[PDB]
Design a protein around this ligand. Structure first.
Ligand SMILES: [Fe+3]
Ligand SMILES: [Zn+2]
Ligand SMILES: [Zn+2]
Ligand SMILES: [Zn+2]
Ligand SMILES: [Zn+2]
Lengths: 172, 172, 172, 172
C-alpha cells in the first residue's frame, strides 16, 4: 500500500482508470472529426478548429485524472484506446450530433463515478468530480445542443450555405 | 402632509404609482423573453442579450419614477407584478412584435399621465415625463418597428436563416 | 424531452422554478426598503443605498437560477411576484431585522432544495447550490446579524443619533 | 420695441423682473445665514460654507434670468433688495427650516410665472423655467427637507452634539 493512501477504495481506483480510458477515447473521436473537416471535399476550417480544440481539452481532462490517481496513491493502468466508430462524419450537423451523444455518454460515466464515491464515503473524490468534471460537462452538452438547434433551423445539411455560414458566424 | 410637498395632486401620486407597476411589469416581460431565447431548442444568444438589456432598462425606468415620487413628497405604494402573458414566445419575430405592442402600451400610459399633469397644472411633472420617458419611448418604438420590418422581409420565422443572420448582423 | 436533459428530475425543475420566484420576491422586498429610506421624513441615504444593492444582488441570484434551468434543459415557468408585507418599514433597525428574517427564509428554501437534489442523486445541482447560494447566504445572514447587534447596542430606534451615525460609519 | 422682440408679453417681462428681485433677495438671506454660522458663539464652519454656496447659486439664478430678459428683448428694471427678516438665525435647525420655507416660496413664484407663460402662449419661456428653475427647486426643497429630518431626529437644537456631528458628517 502507498504511503499516501487514505480513504481510497480499490473500486474507486478501478473506476478512475476506466474514466481515463474514456477521456482518451473522446480525445481520439474529436481528432477523427477534426481531420474530416480538413478534407478538400469538406473544407470547413472552423469546424476542424473547433473539434481539434475539443480533442486537446479531453486530453487535459485525462491528464488531470491521472494526476488525481497519483495524488491519492492509486496506480494508473492504461488500456488500448479504441478507434472511433466512423472515419466519415457525413456533415457538420452529423458531427455535432455525434459529439452531443459522446458528451452525454461521458457525463453518464462521471455520474456513475460520483455515485460510487458517495457510496464509499470518499468526499475528496466527490468534490474533485463536481469541481472539475460535472460543471464542465453540463456547459459542453448545452453548447452542442445550441449548435445542433441552430444548424437544423438554418436547414443543414441540405442547405449548402447553412454549414458555410455557421462556420463563419458561430465558429469563426 | 410631507414637508417637501408643493403642487403635487393626489391623482398624480396615484398615477405615478400605477406607472411604477407598469415599468416593473415590462421589466418582467422582457426577462421572460430573454430566458426563452436561452433555451437549447431556440438558442439565439443575441436575442437573449437584447431582451435582457431591455429588462434592465425598464427596472431603471421604474426606479427613476420611485425617486420622483419621493422627491415630490408622494408615497410609493407597491402592488403585485403580474406574470407575463406567455412562457413560450414562438419566434424572434413574434417576440419583437410583442415587445412593440408592449412599448406602445407603456407609451399610451405615459401620454395619459402627461395629460393628467397638464390638467392639474404640474409643470415639473410634465417636464419630467417629456425629458426622461417620452423621447425614449418614441426611439424604442422606432427601433422595434425597424427590427420587425427587417425580420419579415428576410422571411422570418419560416426562413430558418433569417433569425440566425439577424441575430449576428443586427443584434451582434 | 430536451436534447440536453440528463439526470434532471421533474421535481428539481419544479423546485428551481419556486426558488426563482422567491429570489425575485426578495429583490422586490429590498427595493421597497430602499425607497422607504429615500423618503424626506426618513432620509437615510446609505441605508437606501445598502438595500438597493441587495435588491440588485437578488435579481442576479434569480437570473443565475434561470440560466441553470436552461442549461439543464428544464423550462422556466414564471409566476406573479407578490407585493411586500409592508410599505412603511418603521426604522433602520426594523428593516435590518426584517431583512435578517427574509434571508433566513431564503436560506431554508435552499436547504430544502439541496435535500431534494441529494435525494434525487443530482450532484451537479447540489454542487451549484453549495457553490453559488449557500456560502453567500451564510455570509449575508452574519452581516445582517452584526448590523442588528450594533444598532440595538447604540440604542436604535429611540436614540436619534444611533441610525444617523450607523448610516455614516458602518454603511458609508 | 426691441428689434429682437417676438412673442414676449409685457406681463411676462414684468414677472421676470419680479423674479430677478426674489432671486437676489434669496441670495441676501443665504449670505445673512452664512455669516451667522461664522460667529465665534455659533462656530459651525460647514453650515457657514453650505449657506455661502447657496448664496452664490442664487446670484447665478438671478444673472441667468437677466440674460433671458435681454435675449428676449425685454428691459431689466432693478428694485431695492430688502434686508432679511432676521440677523440671528438661532440654530442650525432653525436656519435649515427657514431655508426650506424660502425655497418653497421661490418655487411658488416660479409656478405662478410658468402659469403666466402658459396663458400667454410663450413656449420658449415655459421651457426655460422648466429646464433651469423647476427641476433645481424640487431638488433643493428635497435636500433641505432631508437635512431638517436628520437634525430633528438627532435631537437638534437641544442636543449639543447633534449640529456638531451634522456639520462634520452631512455638510463636511
Ligand atoms: Fe462620529
Ligand atoms: Zn472530458
Ligand atoms: Zn420604460
Ligand atoms: Zn438570494
Ligand atoms: Zn433660485
Amino acid at each position: 500500500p502507498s504511503q499516501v493512501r487514505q480513504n481510497y477504495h480499490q473500486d474507486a481506483e478501478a473506476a478512475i482508470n476506466r474514466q481515463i480510458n474514456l477521456e482518451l477515447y473522446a480525445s481520439y473521436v474529436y481528432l477523427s472529426m477534426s481531420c474530416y473537416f480538413d478534407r478538400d471535399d469538406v473544407a470547413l476550417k472552423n469546424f476542424a478548429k473547433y473539434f481539434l480544440h475539443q480533442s486537446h481539452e479531453e486530453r487535459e481532462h485525462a491528464e488531470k485524472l491521472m494526476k488525481l490517481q497519483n495524488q491519492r496513491g492509486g496506480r494508473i493502468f492504461l488500456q488500448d484506446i479504441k478507434k472511433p466508430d466512423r472515419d466519415d462524419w457525413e456533415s457538420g450537423l452529423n458531427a455535432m450530433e455525434c459529439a452531443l451523444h459522446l458528451e452525454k455518454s461521458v457525463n453518464q460515466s462521471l455520474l456513475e463515478l460520483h455515485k460510487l464515491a458517495t457510496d464509499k464515503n470518499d468526499p475528496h473524490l466527490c468534490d474533485f468530480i463536481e469541481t472539475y468534471y460535472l460543471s464542465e460537462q453540463v456547459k459542453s452538452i448545452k453548447e452542442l445542443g445550441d449548435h445542433v438547434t441552430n444548424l437544423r433551423k438554418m436547414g443543414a445539411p441540405e442547405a449548402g450555405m447553412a454549414e458555410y455560414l455557421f462556420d463563419k458566424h458561430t465558429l469563426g
